[PDB]
Amino acid sequence: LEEKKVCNGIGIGEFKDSLSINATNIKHFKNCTSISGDLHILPVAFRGDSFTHTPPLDPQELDILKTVKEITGFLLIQAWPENRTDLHAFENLEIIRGRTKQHGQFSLAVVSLNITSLGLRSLKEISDGDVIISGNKNLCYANTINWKKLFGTSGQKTKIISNRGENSCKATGQVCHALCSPEGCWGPEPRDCVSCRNVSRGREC
Amino acid sequence: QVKLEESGGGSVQTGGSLRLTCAASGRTSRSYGMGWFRQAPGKEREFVSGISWRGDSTGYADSVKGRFTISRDNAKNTVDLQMNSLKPEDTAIYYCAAAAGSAWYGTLYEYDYWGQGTQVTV
Ligand SMILES: *[C@@H]1O[C@H](CO)[C@@H](O[C@@H]2O[C@H](CO)[C@@H](O)[C@H](O)[C@H]2NC(C)=O)[C@H](O)[C@H]1NC(C)=O
Ligand SMILES: *[C@@H]1O[C@H](CO)[C@@H](O)[C@H](O)[C@H]1NC(C)=O
Ligand SMILES: *[C@@H]1O[C@H](CO)[C@@H](O)[C@H](O)[C@H]1NC(C)=O
């Protein structure tokens, strides 16, 4: 039995006036499989906000987002817990339609985090919009990805800059597993392969 | 949400003054810390100045001590940056940023909104 549930995104409905996913509203994202709208994750989330009587966000609460397989708008991650290495909360995210875009341009924006990898292993389609992955000092693996395998339209481009240098990434052994194809990876594990060179019983090669 | 537009940039004579402005649009009627940042070619983005919501507290990078001045008119919903005694080291794209709450911060990791930025060449 497969259960689905659609929830409004940030800037819409119950969260018309919310700046970001916070400790208050994240409870309401429980059981959501699909986000009609956008996701913003901003520094205020973890900092808290007196003005709106919002406590700081507990990083464990981001596990609530693991049910989300689809975002019809855009995904914006401008903050993340420092003691986490990937976007684990979105490990089951499959589609970003980019019907609404950030600044009318980006459907996926990962900016200024201390993550080492993306971890978006279930991601298979970005229907529209560009992808910016910028300012992540410790981020590897991002340059390896075959983004044409994920895009929907020919005009979709990519702005991947100011992350960890491919020099350091390769030197630190932070590269794609040997089982991975040349299509890149979301991380060092065999489950992080975009596709497999030989065979795969499922996610793992 | 909030949108910020930077205005006031351009080219300057080496040693000349200049005044950047940043206008905010949207749900602007709440506590925001505002800050100015910049990014030089081939360099990383760095902190320049910041100001609290009430206007009382401010902060400046060491490289701009004495020269620059920050100010805001919350009625007009703006925040400006005087930049006297400019120098070719100050040549960069300058961004206006916002952090929800009263405080300003000296790093970029705390700011929630960003403008598109204006080029400043000296
Ligand atoms: C965090 O999310 C909560 C829940 O949506 C937001 O609380 C709402 O804030 C608006 C504007 O201040 C009020 O009109 C609503 O009455 C609030 N609802 C509830 C249930 O508290 C809050 O603004 C969000 N905070 C941030 C910083 O995004
Ligand atoms: C999630 O589903 C469970 C049923 O398994 C339910 O108890 C819970 O209330 C649901 N979450 C929300 C936010 O309604
Ligand atoms: C990420 O690391 C930088 C140092 O490069 C630090 O200033 C920042 O606070 C870290 N991020 C978080 C969310 O703490």
Question: Which residue, judged by its Cα, is nearest atom 5 of ligand 2?
Answer: A31
Contacts of B59 (CB under 8 A, 6+ apart): B49, B50, B51, B104, B106
Q: What is the dihedral of CA A160, A185, A92, A99, to 10 degrees?
A: 40
Range of the domain at B61: 1-122
Phi, then psi, of A60 in degrees rounded to 5: -70, -25
- The count of domains in chain B is 1
Distance from C-alpha of A80 to C-alpha of B7, rounded to nearest angstrom: 31
Domain A1-205 in this protein, CATH class: alpha beta
β-pairing, A125-126 vs A95-96, is parallel
CATH of the domain at B30: 2.60.40.10
Q: Which two tokens stand for residue B92?
A: 């960069």
**Domain coordinates in residue numbering, chain A:** 1-205
> How many Cβ atoms sit within 10 Å of the Cβ of residue B113?
21
Sheet holding B2-7, edge to edge: B2-7, B19-26, B78-83, B68-73
Give the closest-approach CA distance of B99 to chain A in angstroms: 8
Q: In whole angstroms, how far apart are CA A105 and each of A40, A49, A74, A124, A158? A: 15, 29, 10, 20, 11
The conformation of residue B16, written as its DSSP 8-state character, comes to: -
Q: In whole angstroms, how far apart are CA B85 and each of A150, B21, B68? A: 50, 18, 9
Contacts of B30 in chain A (CB under 8 A): 51-52
Task: Output the CA angle B1-B2-B5, nearest 5 degrees.
Answer: 155
